[PDB]
């Protein structure tokens, strides 16, 4: 049952999500100008309320 | 007699309005355009402030604004014009191809 | 208006005087040997020239202007920029076909609106450095324009560098509105008794915090940065990478140093929110890259959010502002050579058609001592000790440490372990198996070499460089 | 004053072997052998000189040498160096394990060999500086740069019958494991340097002056715990051990980097001179924690051991159980479970050393690992197999080894402390040996199961003979005459348990 080290993989487990969660972000890279200005704008949006918020 | 307030209102309207020209538009040319909105938008809030205080320095801020606004727009108009010389479209989605 | 305010303007005349000089010269005649040369004498003089500004004290020059140690360190660090830009850029400008000439003219005025960055003290001059940082920028990204990538990045920059301007500009009339006074000391002076956080002063900072953040490639405001870097020229990504991002945080450090809404709570959780989304997006969003410069465009992003991190401990701790010095030498040696080796493999300018594709597997066994500068400077952006990377990371983690910020310690923690698979993927790439001749590309090799030798001897030997930025210090 | 020159011996010799690469390709590795036993001679003359035996416990710090030249005088940073007993012990130990390293990679005739040479001693100089340095951003520094040679050599000059990516696998889920725990390690040092500054108001990273640090409780235990991740990092302790099987696995075929940089044990003596005297009251209440993961990878270690079919991770998944008992050792707070768990550092590296070695000379004569391809061993092979038998007799802790002396006492002391602990370890004995004659039987007893074990081997080359029997000798007169290593560590070991008594 132990032969294929299982705390070897469930401490590999982070290395699986840190691939996962850099394959989900490089999507928001697609190459298009609109979407950088719509990101630009979305983080404008989300600054002005956090900073309002407090 | 002029609220300061509805001077910036009206600055932050236009402001708005030209990003969301900017975002909307697939052609360059209304890029530019939605820039040159924004820029003035600001170059007015600048002017609201200077006035409301009394001083010079709001217009001045002014006029370094609009020289940005000449600066960008000679330059952005420079790249449309090569952007349609290579291309044939002012599709600014077709200019997509580095990504990841 | 003294005559010793004018000594105390030298770089900005001197690079002012090169830039009318350089230009008269291409206008007699178009010759790209006697400009660059021309070009790299004023940059030179300029940075000896801080030793008699060094001399001449510290004062405020103008309204505007104000020169303090703080000012020649950081207008040293755009001066050095800049030069390795121009002896980067000469072996590639020979395979340009056009008009080599311009280039030298846009990165003097760009260098001219660094210093003006790094001497800032108002908003008027604020904005006129990053409008005079940005839009020669505009003009280099696309100097090839002929090139697909170049135009794409010319493009994407100059509309969200527009963008961007716009926003700041927004935010400085909003502040203005406010506060009466243009002057960074009065933002925040009419306020009083706990009522610090006014709501316009607050949204007018958060739009300046926008286009700030774009030039600093600060998460979300950081999508442009891969595809600028891999877009624009060699020389140029080196100069945006070092010079840009150096002077705006420069000008950012001063500008949070003396308003008084710098010590707004706000902005500090929404500055350390920002910090954090870029240590690990930045970190996260390198790992599966086969593009160097790409890769160097998240990696800065991850560098810019450890600076954020010694910027949001400014007020509580007291070695914040050594923290950044010390950082941002060990920053700019780094990406400067690593920037400098993708600029000489990508050296001579092969033409508008042709790929400019790095392929950094097996460069040691054609190009060994570049391979070594290389993987040194992959080691210093990882943080190892034994490079000046690492002490700016230890300084950041002292100042995280001392504030008390225990998530950007942990986020910078994790982020430096991302970070460690790619860069040592990266610098053990470079020695598996793959399947110039002028004095010009020789004196690249000598700049990226000297660099590394820099950063590994303040890495084991950390103490000179310590000295001469506790030496700075600002008109407080 | 001769420490100073203790740390640059190793530095300086690997240099030269780069510098004099030019001379020839069978040229650095008799600097590489001159410089190994300069340290050697070096170290034993020190010890020699020491007198460490007609010493008496008089407090921390108590120091045979010690030596300070401000470095980064900003933070209060100096190189600060110090020896003692435990300390001699671990540089003596480095010594013996990095001249058998160069003795064990002498065939090896590459272009780049000089190379290899100089990550080996930069290796092996990182490891005296984390032995020798009580200033903690010092010894932090080494305990970081010990990592940029290993991942180096693990990446390019690992195992040669495994992909490219498999070494690179290996080597960057080292780096990965250990960067981050000691990036962890320096946020404790740090947090600890600013609290004392805040108490005192001087700056320094001096050990002997971040003794005094009056701390709540509850901070002190997060500095501990910080300390004890890189310590855990580098033991092994489970679940943070995977990296020592694929490291081991992945390492260059010939076996030096495995004597070099991972069978000296730098986090267990991390924890004595540094977890246990800066946080004793934390290390207190820590201490169930500790041991019942000592148990666990004693017995984890020794089902993972007979699970292989590769022997070098057998060999790997027994250093996890040793370990686990040395573990339980430490935080007993026992005078004869310390001088135990000296004794059991020591043997361990003499006893996995001669495990490697030998199991690197068997898959250099049979070009393979996999114990279902060898068999009957004992009839084709002139010594390999009954020196394996005899490391492999070591290895479950015979009497007349020094393996015994050091898990005994350790026992011993343990059942003075902690009852049940020390019980369910001796069970962990039993599987010891379980797993060690699982071993025997299947690489040397039997029938042949391949081609290549129906085949008479070569016997081994006197150099390679001539160290194993050292080894062995050595493991016998520990297991016979431990005496002088236990008058040698006695005073350090009492210093250490008497402040971690004396203040909880
Ligand atoms: C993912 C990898 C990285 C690890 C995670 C990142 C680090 C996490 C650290 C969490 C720290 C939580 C602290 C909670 C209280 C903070 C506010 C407070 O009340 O502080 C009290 C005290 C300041 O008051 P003072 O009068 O100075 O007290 C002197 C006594 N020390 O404060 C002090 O005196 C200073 C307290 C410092 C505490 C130690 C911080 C470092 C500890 C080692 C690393 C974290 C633990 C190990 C790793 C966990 C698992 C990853
Ligand atoms: C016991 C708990 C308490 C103590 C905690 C101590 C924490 C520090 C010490 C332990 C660190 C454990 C790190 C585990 C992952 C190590 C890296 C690794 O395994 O990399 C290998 C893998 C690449 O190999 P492969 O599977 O072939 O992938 C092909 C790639 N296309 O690589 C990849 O696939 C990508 C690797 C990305 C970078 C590594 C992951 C970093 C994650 C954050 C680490 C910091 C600690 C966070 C908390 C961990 C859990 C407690
Ligand atoms: C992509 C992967 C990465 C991202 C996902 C994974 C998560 C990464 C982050 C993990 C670490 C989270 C933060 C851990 C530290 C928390 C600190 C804390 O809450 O401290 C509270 C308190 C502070 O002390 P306090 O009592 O306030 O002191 C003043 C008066 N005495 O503290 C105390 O009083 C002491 C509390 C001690 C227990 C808390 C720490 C647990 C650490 C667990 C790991 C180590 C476990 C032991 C070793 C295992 C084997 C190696
Ligand atoms: C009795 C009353 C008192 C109780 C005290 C505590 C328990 C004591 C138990 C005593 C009796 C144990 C008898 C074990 C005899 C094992 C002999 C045997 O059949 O071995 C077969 C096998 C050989 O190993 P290998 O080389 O891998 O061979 C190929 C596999 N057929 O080898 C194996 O399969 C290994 C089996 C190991 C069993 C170890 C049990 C330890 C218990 C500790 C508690
Ligand atoms: C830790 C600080 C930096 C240390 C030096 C890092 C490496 C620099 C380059 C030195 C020369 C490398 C030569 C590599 C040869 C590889 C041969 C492989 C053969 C299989
Ligand atoms: C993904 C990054 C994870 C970073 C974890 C950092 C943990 C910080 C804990 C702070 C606790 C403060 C208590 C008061």
Same mark, same amino acid.
């Given at each position: ?54 | ?100 | ?171 400085? #009339? ?57 877009? #624009? ?25 003396? #308003? ?11 500055? #350390? ?204 | ?278 946080? %004793? ?176 081997? %070569? ?24 005496? %002088? ?20």
């Amino acid at each position: 049952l132990l032969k294929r080290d299982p705390l070897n993989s469930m401490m590999n487990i982070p290395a699986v999500l840190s691939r996962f969660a850099g394959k989900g972000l490089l999507l928001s890279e697609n190459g298009y100008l609109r979407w950088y200005v719509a990101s630009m704008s979305i983080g404008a949006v989300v600054v002005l309320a956090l900073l309002m918020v407090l | 007699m002029i609220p300061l307030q509805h001077g910036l209102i009206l600055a932050a309207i236009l402001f708005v309005l030209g990003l969301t020209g900017l975002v909307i538009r697939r052609n360059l040319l209304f890029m530019l355009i939605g820039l040159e909105i924004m820029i003035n938008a600001s170059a007015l809030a600048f002017v609201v402030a200077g006035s409301y205080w009394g001083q010079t320095d709001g217009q001045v801020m002014y006029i370094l604004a609009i020289s940005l606004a000449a600066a960008e727009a000679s330059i952005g108009l420079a790249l449309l014009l090569q952007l349609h010389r290579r291309r044939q479209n002012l599709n600014i989605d077709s200019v997509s191809e580095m990504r990841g | 208006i003294t005559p010793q305010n004018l000594i105390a303007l030298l770089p900005l005349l001197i690079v002012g005087l090169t830039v009318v000089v350089v230009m008269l010269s291409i206008a007699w005649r178009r010759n790209h040997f006697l400009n660059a040369t021309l070009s790299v004498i004023g940059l030179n003089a300029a940075l000896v020239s801080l030793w008699f500004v060094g001399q001449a004290g510290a004062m405020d020059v103008t309204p505007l202007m104000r020169v303090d140690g703080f000012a020649m360190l950081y207008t040293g660090l755009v001066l050095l920029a800049s030069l390795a830009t121009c002896t980067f850029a000469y072996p590639w400008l020979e395979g340009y076909n056009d008009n080599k000439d311009e280039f030298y003219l846009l990165v003097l005025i760009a260098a001219l609106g660094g210093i003006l960055l790094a001497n800032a003290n108002h908003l008027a001059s604020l904005f006129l450095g990053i409008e005079l940082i940005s839009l020669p920028l505009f003009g280099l990204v696309g100097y090839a324009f002929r090139q697909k990538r170049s135009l794409e990045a010319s493009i994407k920059y100059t509309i969200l560098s527009a963008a961007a301007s716009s926003f700041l500009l927004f935010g400085m #009339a909003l502040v203005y509105a406010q506060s009466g006074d243009l002057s960074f000391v009065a933002l925040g002076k009419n306020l009083g008794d706990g009522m610090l956080n006014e709501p316009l002063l607050l949204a007018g900072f958060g739009l300046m915090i926008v286009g700030l953040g774009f030039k600093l490639s600060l998460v979300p405001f950081h999508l442009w940065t891969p595809d600028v870097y891999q877009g #624009a020229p060699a020389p140029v990504s080196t100069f945006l990478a070092t010079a840009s991002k150096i002077a705006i945080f420069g000008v950012v450090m001063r500008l949070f140093l003396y #308003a008084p809404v710098g010590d707004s709570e706000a902005i500090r959780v929404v500055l #350390a929110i920002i910090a954090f989304a870029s240590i690990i997006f930045g970190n996260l969003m390198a790992l599966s890259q086969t593009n160097i410069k790409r890769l160097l465009g998240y990696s800065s992003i991850s560098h810019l959010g450890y600076l954020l991190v010694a910027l949001i401990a400014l007020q509580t701790g007291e070695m914040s502002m050594e923290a950044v010095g010390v950082y941002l030498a060990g920053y700019l040696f780094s990406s400067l050579g690593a920037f400098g080796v993708v600029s000489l493999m990508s050296s001579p300018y092969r033409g508008p058609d042709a790929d400019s594709l790095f392929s950094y597997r097996g460069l040691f066994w054609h190009r060994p001592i570049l391979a070594a500068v290389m993987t040194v400077m992959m080691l210093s952006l990882a943080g190892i000790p034994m490079t000046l990377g690492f002490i700016g990371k230890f300084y950041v983690l002292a100042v995280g440490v001392q504030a008390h910020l225990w998530w950007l310690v942990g986020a910078v923690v994790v982020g430096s372990a991302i970070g460690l698979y790619y860069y040592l993927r990266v610098a053990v790439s470079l020695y598996l198996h793959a399947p110039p001749s002028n004095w010009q590309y020789s004196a690249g090799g000598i700049v990226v070499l000297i660099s590394a030798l820099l950063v590994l001897v303040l890495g084991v030997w950390p103490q000179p460089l310590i000295s001469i930025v506790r030496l700075a210090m600002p008109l407080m | 004053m001769l420490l100073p020159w203790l740390i640059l011996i190793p530095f300086i010799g690997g240099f030269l072997c780069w510098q004099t690469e030019r001379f020839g390709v069978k040229v650095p590795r008799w600097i590489a052998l001159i410089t190994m036993g300069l340290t050697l001679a070096l170290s034993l003359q020190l010890w020699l000189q020491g007198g460490y035996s007609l010493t008496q416990s008089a407090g921390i710090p108590q120091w045979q040498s010690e030596f300070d030249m401000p470095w980064i005088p900003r933070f209060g940073i100096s190189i600060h160096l110090a020896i003692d007993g435990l300390s001699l012990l671990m540089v003596v130990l480095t010594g013996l394990l990095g001249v058998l390293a160069v003795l064990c990679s002498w065939k090896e005739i590459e272009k780049y060999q000089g190379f290899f040479h100089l990550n080996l001693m930069w290796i092996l100089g990182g490891v005296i500086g984390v032995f020798l340095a009580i200033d903690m951003f010092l010894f932090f520094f080494f305990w970081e740069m010990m990592l940029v040679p290993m991942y180096f050599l693990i990446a390019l000059w690992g195992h040669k019958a495994s992909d490219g990516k498999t070494r690179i696998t290996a080597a960057t889920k080292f780096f990965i494991y250990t960067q981050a725990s000691g990036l962890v390690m320096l946020i404790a040092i740090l947090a600890l340097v600013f609290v004392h500054y805040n108490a005192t108001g001087v700056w320094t990273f001096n050990y002997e002056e971040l003794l005094n640090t009056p701390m709540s409780s509850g901070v002190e235990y997060l500095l501990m715990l910080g300390f004890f991740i890189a310590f855990a990092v580098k033991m092994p302790v489970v679940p943070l051990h995977g990296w020592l099987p694929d490291a081991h696995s992945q390492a260059p075929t010939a076996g030096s980097v495995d004597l070099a940089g991972i069978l000296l044990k730098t986090a267990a003596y991390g924890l004595l001179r540094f977890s246990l005297p800066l946080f %004793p009251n934390a290390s207190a209440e820590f201490a169930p924690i500790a041991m019942w993961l000592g148990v666990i990878g004693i017995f984890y270690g020794a089902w993972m051991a007979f699970a292989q079919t590769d022997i070098k991770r057998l060999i790997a998944y027994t250093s996890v159980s040793h370990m686990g008992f040395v573990l339980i050792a430490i935080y007993t707070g026992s005078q004869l479970a310390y001088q135990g768990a000296v004794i059991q550092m020591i043997a361990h590296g003499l006893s996995a050393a001669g495990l490697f070695i030998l199991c690197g000379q068997l898959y250099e004569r049979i070009h393979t690992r996999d114990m279902r391809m060898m068999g009957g061993l004992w009839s084709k092979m002139k010594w390999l197999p009954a020196l394996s038998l005899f490391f492999a007799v070591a290895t479950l802790g015979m009497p007349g080894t020094g393996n015994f002396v050091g898990e005994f006492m350790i026992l011993f002391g343990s059942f003075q402390v902690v009852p049940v602990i020390t019980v369910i370890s001796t069970f962990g004995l039993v599987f010891a040996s379980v797993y060690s004659l699982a071993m025997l039987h299947r690489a040397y007893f039997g029938k042949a199961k391949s081609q290549i074990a129906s085949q008479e081997l %070569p016997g081994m080359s006197l150099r390679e003979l001539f160290m194993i029997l050292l080894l062995v000798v050595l493991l016998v007169l520990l297991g016979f005459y431990p005496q %002088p290593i236990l008058d040698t560590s006695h005073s350090a070991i009492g210093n250490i348990q008497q402040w971690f008594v004396n203040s909880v």
